[PDB]
Ligand binder design. Sequence first.
Ligand SMILES: Nc1ncnc2c1ncn2[C@@H]1O[C@H](CSCC[C@H](N)C(=O)O)[C@@H](O)[C@H]1O
Length: 237
Amino acid sequence: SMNTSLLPAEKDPMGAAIADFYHRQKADRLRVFSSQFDEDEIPVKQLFRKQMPLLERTALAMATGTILDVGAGSGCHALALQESGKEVSAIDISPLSVEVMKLRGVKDARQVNLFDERFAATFDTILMLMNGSGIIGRLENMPLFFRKMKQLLRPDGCILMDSSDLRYLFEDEDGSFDYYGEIDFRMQYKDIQGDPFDWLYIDFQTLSAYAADNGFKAEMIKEGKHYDYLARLTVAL
Ligand SMILES: Nc1ncnc2c1ncn2[C@@H]1O[C@H](CSCC[C@H](N)C(=O)O)[C@@H](O)[C@H]1O
């Protein structure tokens, strides 16, 4: 099912990049394609940042109690939290990313899809960082997302999520303008081809509206300098 799907290692380009760098301290380029944007790269060394950006640093410092690191990748956030003495569980659908996390010393790294009906555990803080909205994919998945959050959150728990308003990319020189933040991507590493995926960017007002429609409250915590922000989502009282 869509909700339980994991990446096969043979179609796991980001995991393969991470594993090359972990095992060999060297890597080819992780290439990113899109129907909306020209071909680019995701720098691989930066996936191992200790050096994190403002919004991510802000979120880690605020994270308390039992923490879920969603889409944890190389384990950078999970390792930072462990070093603070914090309790963290990390999840990712990438098998090679989970391999690396374990070998780097993440104590509780699991290969599981956030949306899996069988994934059941509760948390005081749920971290969705590095365009944390991405995993949601499309606005039509907002109800599913908030249903899952209700299952995973302890009383007085919160979700800390960063995203970006991409409107500026879709305007002409004079500012004249599916939701524009519904992007698709596909990645390639060496001869490893990943399947295309939906990756949601969401502006704060849109996020607040969908939160309110699903029994959540959104709070702006911090703005960055490139149309980016950190929000806190909680179950509405
Ligand atoms: N449904 C899902 N459940 C869990 N992890 C998912 C997911 N969909 C995507 N992912 C993972 O989310 C990650 C997004 S990339 C961001 C990685 C990491 N948080 C960092 O800041 O560097 C990838 O590792 C990807 O495999």
